[PDB]
Amino acid sequence: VFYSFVLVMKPRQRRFTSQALREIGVAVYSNGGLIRSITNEGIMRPYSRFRDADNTPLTYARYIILQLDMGEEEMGKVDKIIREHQDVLMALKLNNLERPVGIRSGNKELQAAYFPLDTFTRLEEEINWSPQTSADIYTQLEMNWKEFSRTRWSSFLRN
Amino acid sequence: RLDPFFLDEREETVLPSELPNPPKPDPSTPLRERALKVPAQHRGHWVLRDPDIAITREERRTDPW
Amino acid sequence: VNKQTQKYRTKLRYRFRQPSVVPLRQTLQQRHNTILEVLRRRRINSGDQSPYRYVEERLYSKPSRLDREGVKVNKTYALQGLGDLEPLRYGANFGISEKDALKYETVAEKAKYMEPPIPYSSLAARKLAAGALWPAAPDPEGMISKEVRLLRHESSMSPSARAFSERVAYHLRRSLKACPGHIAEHIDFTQLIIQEVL
Amino acid sequence: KASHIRIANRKRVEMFVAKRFHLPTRLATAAPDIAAEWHDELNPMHMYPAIIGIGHVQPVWWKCAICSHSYQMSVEKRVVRGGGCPQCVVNGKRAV
Amino acid sequence: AVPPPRVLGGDYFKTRFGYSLVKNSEMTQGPVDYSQLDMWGEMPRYTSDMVFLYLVSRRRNTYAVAYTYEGKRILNTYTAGNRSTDNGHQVTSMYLNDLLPKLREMRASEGRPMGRGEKVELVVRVMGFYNGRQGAVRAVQDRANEFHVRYFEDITPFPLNGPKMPRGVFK
Amino acid sequence: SATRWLPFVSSDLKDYLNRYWAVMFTVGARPIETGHIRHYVSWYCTRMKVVLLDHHVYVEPLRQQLQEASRTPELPLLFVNK
Amino acid sequence: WIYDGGRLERELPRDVKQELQSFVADAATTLESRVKYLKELDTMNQRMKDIP
RNA sequence: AAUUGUUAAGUGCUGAUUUAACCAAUAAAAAUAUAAAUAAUUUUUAUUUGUUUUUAAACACCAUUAGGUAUAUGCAAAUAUAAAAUUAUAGUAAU
Ligand SMILES: [Zn+2]
Numbered sequence: 050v051f052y053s054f055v056l057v058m059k060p061r062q063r064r065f066t067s068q069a070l071r072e073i074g075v076a077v078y079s080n081g082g083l084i085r086s087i088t089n090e091g092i093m094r095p096y097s098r099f100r101d102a103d104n105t106p107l108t109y110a111r112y113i114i115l116q117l118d119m120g121e122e123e124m125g126k127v128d129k130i131i132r133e134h135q136d137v138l139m140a141l142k143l144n145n146l147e148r149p150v151g152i153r154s155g156n157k158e159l160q161a162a163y164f165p166l167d168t169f170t171r172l173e174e175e176i177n178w179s180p181q182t183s184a185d186i187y188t189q190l191e192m193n194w195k196e197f198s199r200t201r202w203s204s205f206l207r208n
Numbered sequence: 209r210l211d212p213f214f215l216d217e218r219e220e221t222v223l224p225s226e227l228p229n230p231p232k233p234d235p236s237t238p239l240r241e242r243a244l245k246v247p248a249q250h251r252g253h254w255v256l257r258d259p260d261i262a263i264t265r266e267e268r269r270t271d272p273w
Numbered sequence: 274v275n276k277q278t279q280k281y282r283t284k285l286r287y288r289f290r291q292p293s294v295v296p297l298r299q300t301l302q303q304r305h306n307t308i309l310e311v312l313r314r315r316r317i318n319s320g321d322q323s324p325y326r327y328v329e330e331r332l333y334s335k336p337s338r339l340d341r342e343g344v345k346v347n348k349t350y351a352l353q354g355l356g357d358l359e360p361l362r363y364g365a366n367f368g369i370s371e372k373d374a375l376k377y378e379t380v381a382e383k384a385k386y387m388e389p390p391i392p393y394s395s396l397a398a399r400k401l402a403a404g405a406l407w408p409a410a411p412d413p414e415g416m417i418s419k420e421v422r423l424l425r426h427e428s429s430m431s432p433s434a435r436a437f438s439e440r441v442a443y444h445l446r447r448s449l450k451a452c453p454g455h456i457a458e459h460i461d462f463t464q465l466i467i468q469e470v471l
Numbered sequence: 472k473a474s475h476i477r478i479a480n481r482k483r484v485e486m487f488v489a490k491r492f493h494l495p496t497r498l499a500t501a502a503p504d505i506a507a508e509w510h511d512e513l514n515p516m517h518m519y520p521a522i523i524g525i526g527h528v529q530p531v532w533w534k535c536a537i538c539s540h541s542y543q544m545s546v547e548k549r550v551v552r553g554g555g556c557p558q559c560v561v562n563g564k565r566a567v
Numbered sequence: 568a569v570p571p572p573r574v575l576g577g578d579y580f581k582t583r584f585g586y587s588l589v590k591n592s593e594m595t596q597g598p599v600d601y602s603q604l605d606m607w608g609e610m611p612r613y614t615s616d617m618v619f620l621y622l623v624s625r626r627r628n629t630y631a632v633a634y635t636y637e638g639k640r641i642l643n644t645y646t647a648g649n650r651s652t653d654n655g656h657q658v659t660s661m662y663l664n665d666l667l668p669k670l671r672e673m674r675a676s677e678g679r680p681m682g683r684g685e686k687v688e689l690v691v692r693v694m695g696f697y698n699g700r701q702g703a704v705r706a707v708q709d710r711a712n713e714f715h716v717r718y719f720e721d722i723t724p725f726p727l728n729g730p731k732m733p734r735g736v737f738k
Numbered sequence: 739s740a741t742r743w744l745p746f747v748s749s750d751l752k753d754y755l756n757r758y759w760a761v762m763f764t765v766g767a768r769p770i771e772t773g774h775i776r777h778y779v780s781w782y783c784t785r786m787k788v789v790l791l792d793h794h795v796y797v798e799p800l801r802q803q804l805q806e807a808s809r810t811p812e813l814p815l816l817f818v819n820k
Numbered sequence: 821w822i823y824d825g826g827r828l829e830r831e832l833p834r835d836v837k838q839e840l841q842s843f844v845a846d847a848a849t850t851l852e853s854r855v856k857y858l859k860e861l862d863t864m865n866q867r868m869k870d871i872p
Numbered sequence: 873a874a875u876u877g878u879u880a881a882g883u884g885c886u887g888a889u890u891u892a893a894c895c896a897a898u899a900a901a902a903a904u905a906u907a908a909a910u911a912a913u914u915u916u917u918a919u920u921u922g923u924u925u926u927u928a929a930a931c932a933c934c935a936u937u938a939g940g941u942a943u944a945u946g947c948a949a950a951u952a953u954a955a956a957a958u959u960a961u962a963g964u965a966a967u
Contacts, residue, residue, distance in 0.1 A: 072516055096606055098220035102479040102521050104212065106220040125880075133481050134517045144881080144895050154873095154893075211929045218480070218884065225692070225722045227610055231619065231634040242937065245930055249884060252724020253694065255621045260644035261630050265937090269733050271625050272447035273694060273724050274874070275917045281887050289891060296783055413777035416770070419822045428833040436735075443736050446696050450725045451888055455766060455790065463721045467696050468824065473878070474885060474945045485878060487946040490927070726888055730931040731943095742873055743891055 050085055050173045052124055053143035056113040059101060059136045060092050066111065069136050073115070076130050082119030086172065089113055099138035110138060116173050146176060217248045230254050244268060303408040304333060310358050335371075338363050342372045357399045366394035425471055438470040445470070479521035496525045502550050510534040510541055525550045535559065611718045616679070617688040618670070621722065622659065622703045624695035629655035629703055631662040642669055655699030659706035667713065686715035692722040749796040751803035755820040758787040763804060764814040766792035772814050779816075 056073075058066060070087070077084055090112040098106040119127060131140055147165045168176055222230055232254050239245070243262035251257055252273050263271065274282065308328045311317070317324055331337055336344075337351040341363045351363075361367065368390030377383045400406050427435055445467055450457070474486045484493045498506045498520035506520035510532035518531065527546035534541050535556040548554045574580050581587040615636045623630040628648075633641040645662045647654055667687075674681050681687070691707060693700055707714060748754060754761050760779060764772040772788070779786045791797055791813070808815050822828075832840075 069516055094606060096222075098222075100217075100219060100480050102481065102519070104216075104480075121880090130517050132483070133522055135481070135519055135521075136516070138480075142881085142895085148895095150894065153895085157899090214929045218477075224607065224610070225720075227607055228613060229636060229638045231621075231632075231638040231640070233640070246730065247884090247930070250728055250730055250931095252726075253722045255623065255632060255634075255692075255722065256694070256724070258630075258632065258644055260646060261623050261632075265932095267625070268931095269735055270443075271695075272443055272726075277885085277887065278874075279918080281891095284887070285891050294783055299781065299783075407782060410778050410781040413774055415777055416773050421822065421828075423831040424822075424824075424828060426831055426833045428835070429831070440736055447724075448726045448888075449696060450723050454889075455793065459766060459769070462696075462723055463693065463719055465696055466698065466700050468698050471822075472876090472883090472885060472945085475878095475883075483883095485946075486928095486944080488878090489945095491924090491946090495927090728884085728888065733932070745892080 050116045050143075050146045050171075050176070051118040051169070053117070053146060053173045054115040054131065054140050055143070056115055056131065056137055057095075057099065057139045058111045058113060059107060059138060060109050060111050061136060065136065069134065070113070073127075073131060073134075076127050077117055077119060080119065080123035080126055082117055082123055082127070085116035085118055087113065087115050101138065102135055107138070114173065143173070143177075146173065149176075215245065215247055223253070226254055233258055240264065242266070299408055302411065304329070306408055307358065307360055308332065311352070311355070314358060315352075315354075332360065339371050342370055344372075357396065357403065359396060361394070361396055361400060364394050364396045366396070367391055430471070442467070442470040482522045493524070497521065498523050498525060498527075498546060498550075501525060505549055508533050508536050513541060538562070611690070611720075613690070613718075614688065616674075617690055617717070618666075620689055620691045620707070622655070622691065622693045622700070624655055624693065624697040624699035624703060626697065627651075627654075629658045629697075629699035631659050631703065633662070633666055641673065642666055652698050652702035654702070656702030656706045658699075659703040663706065663710055663714065686713060689714045689716045690718040690720070691716055692720055694722050694724070696723070747795060749799045751800065751807065754787070754789065755817055758785075759818065760784055760786040761789065761817040762786060762814050763789045763791055763800065763817075766790055768813060775814060775816055 058069065074084060074087070092109050092111050094108060095110055098108055099110065100106055117124070117127075128142060131137055147169050148163065149168060152160055152163055174182065222228075237259055239259045239262040242264045243259070244264065246257075246263075248257075255261060256263070256273060263273065308325060311328050311332070312324055317328060319327055331350065331352055334350065336346045340346045340349065340351045362369065368388065374383055374387065377386065397406075430438075449465070449467070450462070452460070475483050476486050476489055477483050478489070478493060478497065482493075495501060498509075502525065509520050511534075513532040523531070523546060525546060530543045530545045530548075532541055533544050533549065533556075535558065538556065538558050540556055540558045542557055544554045574583070577587065577589050581589075613636065617636060618641070619634045619636075621630075621632045621634065623632075628646065630644050630646065632644045635641060642662065642665060645658050647658060650658070650661060670687060671681055689707070691704060693704065704719070707716060746757065762772075762775060762779075776786075776788070791800060794800070804813075804815060805811060807817075
């Protein structure tokens with residue numbers, strides 16, 4: 050992934066959030082960029098209540114992961130569009146996607162010994178792992194799991 | 209009249225010591241005489257922001273909170 | 274560096290500091306044990322003094338060791354008859370002699386010109402067989418208490434001491450939660466009361 | 472270093488130029504009657520009078536308050552140079 | 568060291584304590600999806616009818632406030648000037664003297680009698696590390712028939728940055 | 739000096755013994771038995787490495803290897819000269 | 821760290837202790853000791869004056 | 873391992889906790905080591921002081937309870953980091 054954003058948005062109506070995401074995608078595509086992915090993560094209750102433009106503390110918020118491939122000047126344009134949006138309370142810019150964290154400030158001998166195509170070609174869920182994600186889930190995809198998981202409920206149906 | 213943000217938080221944070229629904233006084237009620245106007249970031253607890261427990265200048269020289 | 278890095282550098286310098294380990298309390302503990310052994314073994318005439326301080330002055334003072342080396346001091350400042358209870362500093366086979374050190378007027382000249390001391394002797398062999406080369410460890414006073422009869426008043430101490438104790442009380446009551454977290458996970462702060470600093 | 476503040480919790484500006492320029496020259500604060508005629512539908516959602524200044528030279532949409540008419544005018548032309556509705560000025564000369 | 572004794576049934580377990588394990592509401596729901604975990608899972612479990620007592624001890628003052636589950640101030644903050652160890656003890660005792668009929672009035676307006684047998688559920692939180700901390704909580708300890716304290720904790724400020732401190736503290 | 743400072747950590751008991759002269763492996767829930775060995779070792783002016791097994795990244799490897807060197811599962815354990 | 825528990829007692833202040841030592845102690849022994857100390861100081865000053 | 877970041881980052885001034893801090897710019901790159909100055913005339917991260925007035929709400933300080941003063945950001949001036957050259961002092965009384 051070239052760039053990723055975690056958009057925290059106000060839980061408005063469906064049409065307002067749809068228009069906000071549509072304007073964000075239009076600003077991405079008009080500057081000559083590509084959307085790798087956009088995923089909605091539902092409404093969760095954060096540990097800190099963000100304030101909107103009219104200084105109202107919001108208890109709930111919607112999280113959206115946005116993975117993009119854009120040029121850096123155009124990414125600055127889209128970031129200035131996103132950070133000045135009325136519905137976006139907070140959005141961090143994941144700029145450590147091509148190079149992993151700890152290489153630049155870590156060991157000096159282990160600085161040019163990495164491969165950027167290892168991290169650039171995979172998605173953001175394969176770089177920053179979720180708690181439900183693990184290596185055995187990745188090995189299950191290449192092991193022909195359809196012919197093996199058909200017998201996993203043969204003991205629980207009778208009890 | 210201006211500056212509501214300067215005495216208040218950027219984002220409402222809730223400490224673990226005040227859980228749940230942290231006790232916040234009403235902003236219309238004024239504080240005590242000669243008291244200290246501390247921002248809502250560098251406060252130890254919201255009970256310390258009560259107008260009767262608002263620390264003054266002479267209490268600041270003796271007690272920290 | 275800027276102001277922030279300089280403040281963090283001097284904070285790390287004061288936090289992680291190598292102190293000078295000078296074995297002074299073990300020296301005084303060995304001297305206390307030797308004085309107690311001398312007071313137990315031999316009957317000592319006090320002469321309007323405390324017997325502990327009298328045996329201390331007769332053992333470890335400068336005219337006592339100079340009388341051991343031979344100076345013709347006034348009247349017998351050191352103990353004459355001691356066997357294995359004699360301190361190893363003033364043994365006959367030891368490598369430190371104050372008659373050789375009296376011609377040097379500076380400690381640097383003593384460190385420069387004097388010979389290295391003799392490591393092993395017969396009295397050193399007897400103290401090795403007795404295990405008296407290092408004093409025994411006392412009861413640990415680090416974590417039990419400080420049991421004392423009275424407490425000093427604020428009028429007895431200096432006004433600078435009162436101001437300093439007020440500053441210690443302020444910064445202790447302010448940041449008592451700002452301790453190392455591996456000790457803070459066991460301290461029950463609901464019962465802790467700091468009443469005063471003297 | 473430099474300290475910053477966020478205008479309407481969105482627009483990160485530097486603190487010195489905010490007290491001189493950025494804060495008192497916003498549309499919603501300095502011209503509240505003009506900012507009440509802001510068009511909420513045709514304008515972009517990342518553009519609103521809480522962050523857009525007085526001298527925004529690019530034309531934005533304005534919803535007129537006397538008549539129901541939307542038009543495009545610059546924000547500096549509306550506030551500094553002095554602007555109004557094009558249908559209201561063509562009805563003003565028609566009446567008198 | 569020694570394990571606590573065994574309970575064999577919930578019917579007399581309800582009589583052994585002031586609560587019961589088996590709920591009588593009989594909550595019938597079908598949430599096949601995974602449940603939503605709380606933000607603060609490792610915390611005291613605060614029931615809605617619990618009074619939060621705040622005891623702020625200082626050098627020459629001790630304050631006692633009582634808040635509800637939602638943050639509503641029940642009684643005004645008692646000051647020694649308005650009304651030491653004995654100072655905090657008398658302030659907390661005269662606050663708990665007047666806290667009972669105001670609690671009965673505020674709970675009888677909704678439908679809670681709180682007349683006989685039911686003790687006021689209390690959570691005590693202390694500030695200060697002073698001598699008045701000693702006498703205040705003791706003034707809650709003799710009220711065991713009236714105020715049942717479940718969570719005795721403290722609310723002590725962590726000095727994150729601090730605006731500034733006066734000159735006598737530094738120099 | 740020539741290398742930036744770094745905290746030592748190891749998953750094996752043998753690297754702790756070969757590095758330090760006096761190593762002690764304690765727990766945070768036992769402060770009295772830890773502080774008594776702190777008084778005895780510092781009385782003889784001996785450099786000592788105290789390893790708190792609370793909040794360590796190799797607790798389960800080190801709790802197994804301390805059971806093999808000392809048959810009793812009691813902490814703290816003093817290790818001098820391997 | 822000094823544990824108190826309410827059982828340990830404070831000492832007397834400075835001025836009350838000085839007034840108690842001025843009120844209780846006998847005047848004759850302190851007076852003759854001060855006179856002997858004054859004569860010792862005068863003898864020391866005279867011996868310093870004698871050496872040229 | 874450090875400096876700067878406004879148009880780039882983190883940001884309540886990262887140093888309260890903590891010997892460890894994302895990202896962006898910066899680690900080397902003419903001949904000669906004997907060669908008789910092969911080099912430049914620049915900058916300030918630190919301390920004060922100025923620059924503007926409903927134009928810091930606060931916190932702190934001097935007149936005693938209320939006024940002003942500054943303080944942090946934006947710029948700016950002065951001084952300073954660092955040995956050597958040049959001139960002189962030999963003995964003090966403390967914890
Ligand atoms: Zn019109």
